[PDB]
């Protein structure tokens, strides 16, 4: 090892005496050991792109070869940690140096080698067992929520020569040692994986289970699945935090991985303040979400090669926790700020531009990234199954979905929750547009619904029809004068507003509307569409009978039924049980049926 | 320290453009500082730009005129650009390279700081809370600025953004609830009339003791324009995070900085980027705009106010477009309001402050701030629409409630926006003017003010 | 069936030899074992983008939007391996599948593809948003070998005239539909409403088919005539008279 510096011109260092140095390997330049990466070889010389500031590097300085590309450390110490695109432990730099800056050429391990971890081996394993790549051979009790499963790296195999008893070990002790063909491998609690390589699985399964968020919209009208791909608009004043807060607090996920890819300086200071404050309830107790969450945090002035490799660090962490058997949901905030760092890294290398200056390989990257999500059957013996759900965020200039990044990401992803600012200014929350949003996972969730909530899909189609009809009846009510209104259309324009105001609108600052279970959702939609059906038939039967019914009689014969409909969304799911709310909704149904028979 | 003697080289091997290529340099160090002595005796200064083996490429600040390859000497300093910094720099005028141009001595140093600086740890920065009071009601009252924000001013050529910058500089301070404050001013690429105006206006309005002025002129070396904002921000960081003051940093015409960046890029033989400017201009602007904010454990802040001129009045030119991706909000200096003889010509409809919600409220300015601002914005937009309809419908066929939205317009532009270049209005005077304007409409038309506040502040 | 699957997380530079492996297999099965092969090449856009990436890697002359200047001569070595030969009883029918960026048909990929292939089938977004299947827009569609494959003894004597008349009527209907968006519903003539009726009945009866329905070509021609009987036989100015005398009254 130990080449030397031959020339420096900007961020580009040239190193001599680097004979056996691989491409895209990482190196440390100078006496402060700045981190850089090899981008070209020529004879005995290597061309290095340095990530930090090269100001002060002289000729003859050392160059240390690391031997591996950009990789991540995977072991106990990830939950509640705060990293960046290079996986530097920000909250440990902050406390070991006692300065408010990130030092230049700082070399600290991502997982601390001081904590003693509680490790218990697999009770069936003994000297002579046949263990392959992926097998869980121990468990570290990370915290009260997450059990950390110790797995063999995906490429090893052999017979157990030694396995450690239960006890306390740090992430440097040899906990396993196996043998193959006369060669020994020692393995500790931490394994290293390159971030640009997909982790192996046994098979990629189709996604057929819902991702419960807790909002009535996004769970009825635009469903996502466990293993899916979503995209939202990341803009100012659109009410965007509902998505990440719902995912973190009330969701069926086990592990959460949040990624900022070059956010503003004060926008990161808000996430790093809010996220350690959210809480969940588990087994009756209240715990912090940072017991099952990891954050990757970059700002606009951090190295451009960390604002680009952030997405890969995040997806590798989530693929590491998917291989244990968990269901992970990753969230990448402002994927556009990643695409811009991509374009800038290209520009530095003097590469031919493509449409709008972005590199040639933009759609290839954006597609091979989202192809890393999904449900899988995990490699290894104890027969588990995991999942990774990716939620990206795009920032189109002025709400224009023609930028190359927005066009590509809308071509790829299957769901699209369209947050709107217009609805936010009207105090309509969650401000989802319901007219430009979509979801193409609705045919995969068909055995699930038909097995668990049989009478739901018809209600979904009916509600979508009603909400579309109230909208394409707009010029009819403006260019004409609200009077030439067939009674079917009066019934629509009233019940659709009932839906818009008492189903699609939810308020998190309450004790009853933070979380809406799905039985409550299907009940609240069934009562509304059943009303609609009965009130529509009552009118269109007595069409020519000299007893013309109009909405004016329907709104006077049932003046409390309508209130109780508009009051369905106050039934607490905790202070009232599930059978109680079911019986209340059934009573309201029978009262509706009565008060509709006592009208004919 | 550095106790080894320095080396002088008489081995110039090439001269072209602003670059001198020297050979037989012992261990050339990148970005080093060099002192050249010309054949007759004049002394110039330079910086190492490229290094290769035993060969250095020095960029000379004052040009390469009269330099030959047989009698010019180059003495190598041994280190990089470190500037001296102390608290006595408040009340002084330096040029772009940091030497005194106000008939005073050199800075006696409290420390020597590297002007490139290190990035702030994203985990130590905290959220901006209180208010920075500029004394201009168009900004204070409706586009409030928080302690730690970064909010630019967008203007064009001929518009009066330098006088707005000067008024902000000589009025800004902290809100007087019921003062550790300093200003660092960086003027880049200004002509001589602008520089004269700044210098004299600051030093004769009795305020040049909480100001540090860095003046860079259009005929100065174009490398000094690259290091001017980094000296300004190094001084600001010293003041705010070691002496615990509240610093406001004003940087005038970042477009000239971008032009100097383009020049020193093309000197490296780099192929141009989109529309002229280098491909790495985002990172270079971000290493400037992100040297700001509040931090944990210190009682000081840094607030930044970049000022730009939009070429061709375009909002999608690379410089405004990239400054929008790093900063939080914008102020707009308008040309229709300038031609109508309104000062300051600030258009409040396109302007925005992304962190106003944090700067205003109870205990910071007053409990009625947000509602007064919302109602003034609403009434102004409605009055503009009414003045549009008046031109086709006729002024004799307007309602009585549309005749109120047309008196509010005149009174708002002539009494609230239009201020006066030497008139200092505290936040409370601004809000009282807002209420004097809102009392044109009956209490029942002010829809955006909650009734619990229309009871305390309307009847006066 | 013989599948050659290169997915989105696979080597990019190996997308350059996948269609050539497929087509070598096809040529062996067709011109030596004498079978009738049907080749489906999915997302020639990804092939073209891998080609652009390899071209930019070694700094070659670009064409429009950065694609190499030899993209025509490269796509033509793939598309031109399809046809029949003299003395052998096989064939190769190619059906590439494209995705046009931003629905633009002037992009280099569709534009260079349309100069090489013998027609194209245009899949429209405006018809997808109306829940129409198959969402095929017949005006930007074309097949260059139709004139020699239809007619007497091949399908039926009237095929070509019905096709041309349906084209003319569809174009005039789409003109009227855009005139009425400016001049309003009540400024149209008695014939513009005939065209606006033809448009609806055509888009809902002829195009819209259902995803498992197999219409013999005579059923298609009967539907076409049922659509052409909306107009008096003097508006059908592309059909000769001796065809209207035999096929229009029925």
């Amino acid at each position: 090892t130990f080449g030397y510096v031959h020339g420096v011109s900007g961020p580009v260092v040239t190193a001599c005496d680097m004979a056996g140095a691989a491409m895209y390997e990482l190196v440390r330049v100078g006496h402060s050991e700045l981190v850089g990466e090899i981008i070209r070889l020529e004879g005995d010389m290597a061309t290095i792109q340095v990530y930090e500031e090269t100001s002060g590097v002289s000729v003859g300085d050392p160059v240390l070869r690391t031997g591996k590309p950009l990789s991540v450390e995977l072991g106990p110490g990830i939950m509640g940690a705060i990293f960046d695109g290079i996986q530097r432990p920000l909250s440990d730099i902050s406390s070991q140096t006692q300065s408010i800056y990130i030092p230049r050429g700082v070399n600290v391990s991502a997982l601390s080698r001081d904590i003693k971890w509680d490790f218990t081996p697999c009770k069936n394993l003994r000297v002579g067992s046949h263990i392959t790549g992926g097998d869980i051979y121990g468990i570290v009790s990370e915290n009260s929520l997450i059990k950390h499963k110790i797995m063999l790296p995906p490429r090893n195999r052999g017979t157990v020569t030694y396995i450690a008893p239960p006890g306390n070990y740090d992430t440097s002790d040899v906990v396993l040692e196996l043998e193959f063909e006369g060669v020994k491998e020692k393995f500790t609690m931490v394994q290293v994986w390159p971030v640009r390589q997909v982790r192996p699985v046994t098979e990629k399964l189709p996604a057929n289970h819902p991702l419960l968020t807790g909002q009535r919209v996004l769970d009825a009208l635009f469903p996502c699945v466990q293993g899916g791909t979503t995209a939202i608009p990341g803009a100012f004043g659109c009410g965007k935090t509902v998505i990440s807060q719902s995912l973190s607090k009330y969701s069926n996920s086990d592990v959460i991985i949040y990624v900022g890819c070059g956010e503003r300086g004060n926008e990161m200071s808000e996430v790093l303040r809010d996220f350690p404050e959210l809480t969940m309830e588990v087994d009756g107790k209240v715990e912090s979400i940072m017991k099952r969450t990891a954050l990757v945090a970059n700002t606009s002035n951090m190295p451009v090669a960390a604002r680009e490799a952030s997405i890969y660090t995040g997806i590798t962490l989530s693929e590491y926790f998917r291989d244990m058997g968990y269901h992970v949901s990753m969230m990448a905030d402002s994927t556009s700020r990643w695409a811009e760092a991509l374009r800038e890294i290209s520009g530095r290398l003097a590469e031919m531009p493509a449409d709008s200056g972005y590199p040639a390989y933009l759609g290839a990257r954006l597609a091979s990234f989202y192809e890393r999500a999904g449900r899988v059957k995990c490699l290894g013996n104890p027969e588990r199954e995991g999942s990774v759900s990716i939620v990206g965020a795009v920032s189109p200039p002025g709400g224009d979905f023609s930028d190359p990044v927005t066009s590509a990401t809308l071509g790829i992803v299957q769901v699209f929750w369209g947050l709107d600012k217009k609805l936010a200014q009207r105090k309509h929350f969650p401000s989802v547009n319901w007219l430009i949003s979509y979801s193409k996972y609705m045919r995969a969730l068909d055995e699930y619904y038909d097995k668990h909530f049989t009478e739901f899909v018809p209600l979904r189609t009916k509600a979508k029809e009603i909400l579309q009809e109230e909208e394409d009846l707009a010029e009819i009510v403006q260019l004409v004068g609200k009077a030439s209104l067939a009674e079917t259309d009066k019934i629509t324009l009233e019940v659709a507003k009932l839906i818009k105001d008492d189903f699609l609108q939810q308020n998190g600052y309450t004790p009853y509307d933070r979380f809406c279970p799905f039985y409550k959702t299907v009940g609240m939609l069934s009562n509304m569409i059943a009303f609609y059906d009965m009130a529509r038939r009552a009118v269109e039967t007595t069409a020519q009978s000299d007893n013309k019914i109009t909405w004016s009689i329907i709104r006077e014969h049932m003046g409390d039924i309508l209130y109780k409909l508009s009051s369905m969304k106050f039934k607490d799911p905790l202070k009232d049980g599930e059978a109680k709310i079911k019986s209340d909704y059934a009573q309201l149904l029978e009262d509706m049926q009565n008060a509709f028979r006592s009208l004919e | 320290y550095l106790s080894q003697p320095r080396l002088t080289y008489k081995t110039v091997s090439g001269v072209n453009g602003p670059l001198v290529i020297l050979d037989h340099v012992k261990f050339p160090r990148y970005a080093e500082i060099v002192h050249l002595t010309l054949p007759d005796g004049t002394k110039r200064s330079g910086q190492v730009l490229e290094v290769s083996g035993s060969k250095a490429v020095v960029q000379v600040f004052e040009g390469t005129s009269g330099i030959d390859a047989k009698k010019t000497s180059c003495e190598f300093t041994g280190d990089i650009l470190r500037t001296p910094v102390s608290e006595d720099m408040l009340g002084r005028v330096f040029n772009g390279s940091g030497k005194p141009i106000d008939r005073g001595p050199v800075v006696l140093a409290e420390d020597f700081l590297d002007i490139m600086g290190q990035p702030i740890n994203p985990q130590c920065r905290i959220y901006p809370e209180e208010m920075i009071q500029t004394g201009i009601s168009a900004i204070d009252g409706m586009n409030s600025i928080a302690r730690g924000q970064k909010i630019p001013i967008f203007s064009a050529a001929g518009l009066p953004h330098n006088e707005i910058a000067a008024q902000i500089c000589r009025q800004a301070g902290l809100v007087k609830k019921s003062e550790n404050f300093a200003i660092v001013f960086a003027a880049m690429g200004v002509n001589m009339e602008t520089a004269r105006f700044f210098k004299s206006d600051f030093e004769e309005n009795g305020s040049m003791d909480n100001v540090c002025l860095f003046l860079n002129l259009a005929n100065d070396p174009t490398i000094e324009r690259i290091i001017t904002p980094r000296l300004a921000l190094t001084t600001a960081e010293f003041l705010a995070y070691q002496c615990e003051k509240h610093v406001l940093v004003i940087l005038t015409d970042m477009s000239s900085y971008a032009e100097a960046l383009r020049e020193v890029s093309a000197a490296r033989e780099e192929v141009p980027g989109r529309r002229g400017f280098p491909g790495y201009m985002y990172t270079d602007l971000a290493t400037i705009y992100e040297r700001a904010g509040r931090v944990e454990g210190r009682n000081g802040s840094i607030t930044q106010i970049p000022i730009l001129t939009m070429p061709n009045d375009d909002i999608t030119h690379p410089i405004p477009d990239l400054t929008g991706y790093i900063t939080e909000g914008q102020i707009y200096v308008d040309r229709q309001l300038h031609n109508r003889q309104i000062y300051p010509p600030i258009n409040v409809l396109p302007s925005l402050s992304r962190l106003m919600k944090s700067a205003i409220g109870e205990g910071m300015t007053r409990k009625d701030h947000a509602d007064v601002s919302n109602q003034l914005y609403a009434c102004y937009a409605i009055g503009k629409d009414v003045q549009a309809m008046k031109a086709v419908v006729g002024e004799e066929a307007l309602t009585s409630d549309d005749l109120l939205y047309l008196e509010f317009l005149q009174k708002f532009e002539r009494n609230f926006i239009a201020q006066g270049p030497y008139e200092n209005r505290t936040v409370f005077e601004t809000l009282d003017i807002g209420w004097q304007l809102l009392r044109i409409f009956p209490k029942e038309m002010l829809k955006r003010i909650p009734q619990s506040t229309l009871s305390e502040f309307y009847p006066r | 069936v013989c599948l050659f699957l290169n997915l989105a997380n696979d080597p990019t530079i190996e997308r350059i030899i996948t269609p050539r492996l497929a087509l070598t297999t096809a040529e062996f099965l067709a011109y030596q074992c004498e079978k009738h092969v049907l080749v489906i090449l999915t997302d020639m856009s990804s092939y073209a983008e891998a080609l652009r990436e390899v071209s930019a890697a070694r700094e070659e002359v670009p064409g429009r939007r950065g694609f190499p200047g030899y993209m025509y001569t490269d796509l033509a070595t793939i598309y031109e391996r399809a046809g029949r030969v003299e003395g052998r009883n096989g064939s190769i029918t190619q059906i590439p599948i494209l995705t046009m960026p931003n629905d633009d048909i002037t992009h280099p990929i569709p534009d260079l593809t349309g100069y090489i292939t013998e027609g194209q089938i245009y899949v429209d977004r405006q018809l997808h948003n109306r829940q129409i299947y198959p969402p095929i827009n017949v005006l930007p569609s074309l097949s260059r070998l139709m004139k020699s494959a239809i007619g007497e003894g091949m399908t039926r004597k009237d095929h070509a005239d019905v096709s041309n008349q349906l084209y003319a009527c569809y174009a005039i209907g789409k003109d009227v539909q855009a005139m009425k968006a400016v001049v309003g519903e009540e400024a149209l003539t008695s014939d513009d409403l005939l065209y606006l009726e033809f448009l609806q009945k055509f888009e809902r009866n002829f195009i819209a088919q259902g995803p498992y329905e197999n219409r013999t070509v005579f059923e298609t021609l009967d539907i076409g005539w049922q659509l052409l009987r909306i107009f008096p036989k003097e508006m059908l100015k592309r059909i000769p008279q001796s065809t209207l005398s035999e096929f229009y009254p029925r």
Binding site: A350, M352, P353 | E269, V271, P272 | -
Partner: peptide, 18 residues
């Protein structure tokens, strides 16, 4: 862009082969 990259490539070919 392509023309300027060609000029620079020819520069860095000449200076190295000479």
């Amino acid at each position: 862009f392509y023309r300027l990259k060609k000029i620079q490539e020819k520069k860095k070919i000449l200076k190295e082969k000479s």
